[PDB]
Structure 1
Amino acid sequence: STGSATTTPIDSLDDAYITPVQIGTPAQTLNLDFDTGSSDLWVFSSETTASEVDGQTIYTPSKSTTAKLLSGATWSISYGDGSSSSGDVYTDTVSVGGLTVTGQAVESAKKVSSSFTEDSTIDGLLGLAFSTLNTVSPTQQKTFFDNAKASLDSPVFTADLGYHAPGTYNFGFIDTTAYTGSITYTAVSTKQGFWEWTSTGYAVGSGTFKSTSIDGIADTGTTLLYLPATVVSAYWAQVSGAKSSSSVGGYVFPCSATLPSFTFGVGSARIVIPGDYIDFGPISTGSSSCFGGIQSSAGIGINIFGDVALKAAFVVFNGATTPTLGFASK
Structure 2
Amino acid sequence: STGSATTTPIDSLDDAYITPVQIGTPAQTLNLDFDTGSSDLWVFSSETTASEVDGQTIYTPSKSTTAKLLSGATWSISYGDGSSSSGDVYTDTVSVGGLTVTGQAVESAKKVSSSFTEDSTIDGLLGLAFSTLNTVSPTQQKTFFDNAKASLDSPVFTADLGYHAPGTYNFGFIDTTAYTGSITYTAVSTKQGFWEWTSTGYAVGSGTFKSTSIDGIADTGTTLLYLPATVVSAYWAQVSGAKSSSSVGGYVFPCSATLPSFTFGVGSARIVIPGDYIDFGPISTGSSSCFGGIQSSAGIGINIFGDVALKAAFVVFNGATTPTLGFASK
Give the TM bin, normalised by the shorter chain.
over 0.9
- Whole-Å separation in 1 of the counterparts to 2:294 and 2:30: 31
In the TM superposition, what is the alpha-carbon distance from 1:32 to its structure 2 partner?
A: 0.0
- Whole-Å separation in 2 of the counterparts to 1:25 and 1:198: 42
- Whole-Å separation in 1 of the counterparts to 2:200 and 2:117: 39
Q: Deviation string for 1:145-203 (max 9, x for gaps)?
A: 00000000000000000000000000000000000000000000000000000000000
Question: 1:2 maps to what in 2?
Answer: 2
In the TM superposition, what is the alpha-carbon distance from 1:227 to its structure 2 partner?
A: 0.1
- Whole-Å separation in 1 of the counterparts to 2:53 and 2:25: 23
- Whole-Å separation in 2 of the counterparts to 1:121 and 1:32: 9
2:221 is paired with a residue whose SS is coil
1:116 is paired with a residue whose SS is helix
Q: Deviation string for 1:36-57 (max 9, x for gaps)?
A: 0000000000000000000000
Question: 2:92 maps to what in 1?
Answer: 92
- Whole-Å separation in 2 of the counterparts to 1:182 and 1:248: 40
In the TM superposition, what is the alpha-carbon distance from 1:294 to its structure 2 partner?
A: 0.1
- Whole-Å separation in 1 of the counterparts to 2:73 and 2:100: 23
| Residue 275 of structure 2 corresponds to residue 275 of structure 1 | yes
- Whole-Å separation in 1 of the counterparts to 2:284 and 2:312: 26
2:286 is paired with a residue whose SS is coil
Q: Deviation string for 1:55-79 (max 9, x for gaps)?
A: 0000000000000000000000000
| Residue 162 of structure 2 corresponds to residue 162 of structure 1 | yes
In the TM superposition, what is the alpha-carbon distance from 1:306 to its structure 2 partner?
A: 0.0
- Whole-Å separation in 2 of the counterparts to 1:246 and 1:289: 14
Question: 1:108 maps to what in 2?
Answer: 108
Q: Deviation string for 1:14-51 (max 9, x for gaps)?
A: 00000000000000000000000000000000000000
2:298 is paired with a residue whose SS is coil
- Whole-Å separation in 2 of the counterparts to 1:249 and 1:88: 34
2:180 is paired with a residue whose SS is coil
In the TM superposition, what is the alpha-carbon distance from 1:263 to its structure 2 partner?
A: 0.0
Cα RMSD after superposing both structures: 0.1
- Whole-Å separation in 1 of the counterparts to 2:15 and 2:238: 24
1:192 is paired with a residue whose SS is coil
Q: Deviation string for 1:56-106 (max 9, x for gaps)?
A: 000000000000000000000000000000000000000000000000000
Percent identity, aligned pairs only?
A: 100
Report the TM-score when normalising by structure 2: 1.00
Q: Deviation string for 1:186-232 (max 9, x for gaps)?
A: 00000000000000000000000000000000000000000000000
- Whole-Å separation in 2 of the counterparts to 1:94 and 1:239: 46
In the TM superposition, what is the alpha-carbon distance from 1:132 to its structure 2 partner?
A: 0.1
- Whole-Å separation in 1 of the counterparts to 2:14 and 2:75: 28
- Whole-Å separation in 2 of the counterparts to 1:295 and 1:197: 19
- Whole-Å separation in 2 of the counterparts to 1:175 and 1:184: 15
In the TM superposition, what is the alpha-carbon distance from 1:295 to its structure 2 partner?
A: 0.1
- Whole-Å separation in 2 of the counterparts to 1:51 and 1:241: 43
Runs of 4+ in 1 over 4 A off after TM superposition: none
- Whole-Å separation in 2 of the counterparts to 1:81 and 1:19: 21
- Whole-Å separation in 2 of the counterparts to 1:50 and 1:261: 44
1:276 is paired with a residue whose SS is helix
- Whole-Å separation in 1 of the counterparts to 2:77 and 2:303: 20
Report the TM-score when normalising by structure 1: 1.00
In the TM superposition, what is the alpha-carbon distance from 1:133 to its structure 2 partner?
A: 0.0
Question: 1:228 maps to what in 2?
Answer: 228
2:222 is paired with a residue whose SS is coil
- Whole-Å separation in 1 of the counterparts to 2:271 and 2:53: 39
- Whole-Å separation in 1 of the counterparts to 2:23 and 2:155: 22
Give unmatched runs, 5+ long, in structure 2.
none
- Whole-Å separation in 2 of the counterparts to 1:34 and 1:312: 17
Give the length in aligned residue pairs.
330
- Whole-Å separation in 2 of the counterparts to 1:47 and 1:204: 48
2:12 is paired with a residue whose SS is coil
- Whole-Å separation in 2 of the counterparts to 1:313 and 1:114: 32
- Whole-Å separation in 2 of the counterparts to 1:246 and 1:180: 40
- Whole-Å separation in 2 of the counterparts to 1:171 and 1:36: 13
- Whole-Å separation in 2 of the counterparts to 1:309 and 1:34: 16
Question: 2:196 maps to what in 1?
Answer: 196
